[PDB]
Write an enzyme that holds these catalytic residues in place. Sequence first.
Site, PDB file in Angstrom:
ATOM      1  N   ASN A  37       0.960  -1.303  -0.062  1.00  0.00           N
ATOM      2  CA  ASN A  37      -0.056   0.081   0.125  1.00  0.00           C
ATOM      3  C   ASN A  37       0.918   1.480   0.028  1.00  0.00           C
ATOM      4  O   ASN A  37       0.547   2.341   0.024  1.00  0.00           O
ATOM      5  CB  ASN A  37      -0.924   0.086   1.080  1.00  0.00           C
TER       6      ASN A  37
ATOM      7  N   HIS B 119       2.883   2.353   2.362  1.00  0.00           N
ATOM      8  CA  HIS B 119       3.050   2.726   3.913  1.00  0.00           C
ATOM      9  C   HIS B 119       4.314   2.149   4.379  1.00  0.00           C
ATOM     10  O   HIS B 119       4.950   1.029   4.099  1.00  0.00           O
ATOM     11  CB  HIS B 119       1.621   2.180   4.634  1.00  0.00           C
TER      12      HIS B 119
ATOM     13  N   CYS C  69       5.244   7.625   9.872  1.00  0.00           N
ATOM     14  CA  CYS C  69       6.217   8.259   9.274  1.00  0.00           C
ATOM     15  C   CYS C  69       5.856   8.222   7.887  1.00  0.00           C
ATOM     16  O   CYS C  69       5.577   7.175   7.157  1.00  0.00           O
ATOM     17  CB  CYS C  69       7.658   7.606   9.297  1.00  0.00           C
TER      18      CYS C  69
END
Lengths: 268, 269
Positions: free
Chosen positions: A190, A192, A227
């Site tokens: 994804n 991330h 983050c």
Amino acid sequence: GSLTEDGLSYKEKFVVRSYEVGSNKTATVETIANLLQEVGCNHAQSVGFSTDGFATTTTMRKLHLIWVTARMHIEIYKYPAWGDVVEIETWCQSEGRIGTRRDWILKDSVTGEVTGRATSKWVMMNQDTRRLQKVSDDVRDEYLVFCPQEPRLAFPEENNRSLKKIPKLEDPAQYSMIGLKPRRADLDMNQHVNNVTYIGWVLESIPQEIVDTHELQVITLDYRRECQQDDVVDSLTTTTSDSQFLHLLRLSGDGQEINRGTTLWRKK
Amino acid sequence: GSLTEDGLSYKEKFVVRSYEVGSNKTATVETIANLLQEVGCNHAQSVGFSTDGFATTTTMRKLHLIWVTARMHIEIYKYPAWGDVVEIETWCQSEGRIGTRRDWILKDSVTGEVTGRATSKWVMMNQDTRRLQKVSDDVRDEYLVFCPQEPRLAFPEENNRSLKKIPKLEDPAQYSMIGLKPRRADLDMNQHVNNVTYIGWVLESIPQEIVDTHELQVITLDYRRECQQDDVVDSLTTTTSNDSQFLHLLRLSGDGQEINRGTTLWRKK
Ligand SMILES: OCc1cc(-c2ccccc2)on1
Ligand SMILES: OCc1cc(-c2ccccc2)on1
């Protein structure tokens, strides 16, 4: 891997790979965390939930809701050596509208001895607004039939290490590693940052002399904020003591907290 | 995994893991490179050589000699999806006193179709002085009985891509990613930066728009010098080209010392 006989837990065996080990020729704590995520994903796939790390239902996907890790706690007694087979059993259990727990037990496949255990707390969040929301009595019902109903805890005691409150490290830190940033290998499907990357960032500020003369026994890590793929992180560590440390990860510029944690190390 | 019937090659199957895939839910090229290293290590183990990535004999260890990768070349036709089983076969062949080659073939386990191939050139070096040396007859003799004697090449073609000379990128680069540094997960058991980390660093300077609209078909990477655990690296890329091609350079952030050069070829999705 497979669901167990009662269908309320999942088990899988892994052979430790050459690139998965550290200087002691045994699996790193990041390799262990990646295997915990792998067996959690295979457990979701076995019963029809999403296989993207969020283990969502069709109704959660229509509402843009996901499950996100708030805390990871891992205790290792013996790290498996290169070529060793480790068997991991995992299960989930609801803890009310607040959230859900996923637990794991790690065993030596040859001896059947418990070599490690882990627990994690998950909350439900809207993927776009990032606002938390209590679990509804329609989403909850979808999950109940895949979990044990009597308590089954990898860390059974009232107020053990896995539930302890973690304080905020105060400046100046005793040790630091600044300017850490993720590369594409640190991202998931994804785009991330993978939860295991933050474990690696926490450990970057432990002095090399500790890593060389000690073994990591326990790590507790809270996740407060992501983050982003374009953010930069500072990793801070202070000795609080076996050797014990308090940890803080914060964004390099404004100092926004992303994670806090503690580690406990045993002399070799 | 196991040595094959004739004992001159090694095969192993791997199931692609959830954390091993990229945005297309298929294995990344770094996952493929890690599996190539894994099967190479299991092949060394199966016949008694070191299992630290250097595949040394007792005699080489007494002389402080190791095998080090000078070039890696990978071509992928189809990346395996999450949960897919990929079978990889690998073998070595000496190329004279200069060095040795390790080759690999990747197949879809269900169909038996070839989904990728790779080749690598290795040189012998003293681990302390970093000086290269021609392979002695006594060292080479120890390895000959584990290799096919008739040529067996993953890249047989006339003037194939795996042997092409790579030029040095000239400043200014079209794209760059500055200040890259290894963390403990990037190191091997001997505290050296893993060869796969340099592949990741090369790819950091490819624009995200290319990664989103193309698939990596070929990567050729030369290794000239190690990045030490305390060094900092700059990754530079310039387009050289439906297919898109790039020239790559990795150099130390401060003085600009070259550590790697390479090229990549990408096909539009
Ligand atoms: O309510 C969250 C949750 C997730 C699960 C789960 C159960 C089994 C497999 C995968 C996920 O159980 N409860
Ligand atoms: O001359 C280098 C070399 C290395 C090998 C090798 C063969 C089999 C397994 C592992 C390594 O063969 N030749």
